Amino acid sequence: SFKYESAVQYRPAPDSYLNPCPQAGRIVKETYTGINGTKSLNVYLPYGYDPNKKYNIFYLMHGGGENENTIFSNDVKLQNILDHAIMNGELEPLIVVTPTFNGGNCTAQNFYQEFRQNVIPFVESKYSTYAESTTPQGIAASRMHRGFGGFSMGGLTTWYVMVNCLDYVAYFMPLSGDYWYGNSPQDKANSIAEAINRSGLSKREYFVFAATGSEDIAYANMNPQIEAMKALPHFDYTSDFSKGNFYFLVAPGATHWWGYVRHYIYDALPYFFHELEHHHHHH
């Protein structure tokens, strides 16, 4: 079983996890129409996916110049990691969706709107999540079973998703991404605080697991933001999400490259979705 650590450390997946696992989850290519026109995404279903069961769902965004296919391409191979981790019992089965911020009027920053209105209702009406319906009320009532993350520009997307979508999403994984508000780290922090206040949520209802590499240029802006967030009452700093809600993993020597960032996901994603989960688990 999984056990929460209070300060989890960078730990890459074994080399063999980058290769195909014979217990492969199905990746389905989907096309949908929304406020930024006709676009595509991929949905990863866990091996043994049973549509009579309910699954947590994690949405994960690519970086600049990439697209909805990148994360599951040979350039990244995240599905192989997911497959092997799920078969070995390190990660509880979940749906992982890779959308895009390209197309139409869409930008990494404004994607949250298409996410709220088109992406969630499209995905979660077809696949089996904890959403009982895809009205605003049904999405909001299943928020504990929904997560959002992304790398670089997709990291930035994640931040704008948290500030605009706390009603719909409880778990956030910004990977090497800055957030732009005011002109100081404190102003960034305070914008996030004000979003949390408007939401009415308690400290046990939102969770942030950020990460980057110590040789990734994103560290320069992320670290002061994280420090300013630590000062806020809204966040209790620890990776033990049974006790707190905010952690920053820094991989020593890691650069701004999917080859490393895929391992952040391997490290952080097993920490998601246990709070108020419907299983009886000791973590």
Place this chain on the structure above:
Amino acid sequence: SFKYESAVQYRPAPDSYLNPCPQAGRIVKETYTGINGTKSLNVYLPYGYDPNKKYNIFYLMHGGGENENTIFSNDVKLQNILDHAIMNGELEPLIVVTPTFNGGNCTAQNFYQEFRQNVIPFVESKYSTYAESTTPQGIAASRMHRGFGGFSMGGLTTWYVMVNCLDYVAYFMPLSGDYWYGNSPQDKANSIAEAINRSGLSKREYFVFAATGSEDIAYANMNPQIEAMKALPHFDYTSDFSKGNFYFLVAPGATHWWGYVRHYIYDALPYFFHELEHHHHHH
């Protein structure tokens, strides 16, 4: 609303709480037969008690030379404190039961057996608790909504209840009571640890809020026991039961007397029954 503090301090109820509250809960005198013959207890029902609702239940034991009527007599007046705290919103409504360790073969130490077999089934078949039935399975499945405490010899009773009844009871309030096992504080601690291990429970499924006065002779044996318990992995020391599960409140200058001990209860009882509660509360 109530908010958890990480190190709650001794704070007596206002003087006016010792007087009758016009929103008085009903105290019902009950007689039952069990393994120690025919005996009595009192059941305190909260003001507005609705038998269509479910209530948490706290069992509370008297000291040496006292009886099932003592805690709700003029010598103690706990019901007035309960009444006023419940009317002012400081304590969520609950059933409080005062049994006795007198009669038959019963002793403060061996009461746990009569408690398991006769007291719980008698009380919880008549009054409205979270127990869906009073078989061993129905009691065990409602354990998160059951608590046990007591003063002096009743404190000792509480300890023997924890070591024998973790399957039935999640919250424990030993007040000025020692536990006897081995001849060192570590041996006491290790006996409690071994009981927790046999139960299969996690750290989020049992809670201990101990207390005494700094001028109460019980402090002499309680404090080394508590220290030895702190060292165990089984217990995370803090009164914030959303994060940990073990606290020791020491009232400075307080003596071995109900006049003080009733205030420990006022302080500690609002901390009980919130973990995995069926209400939507921010604490």
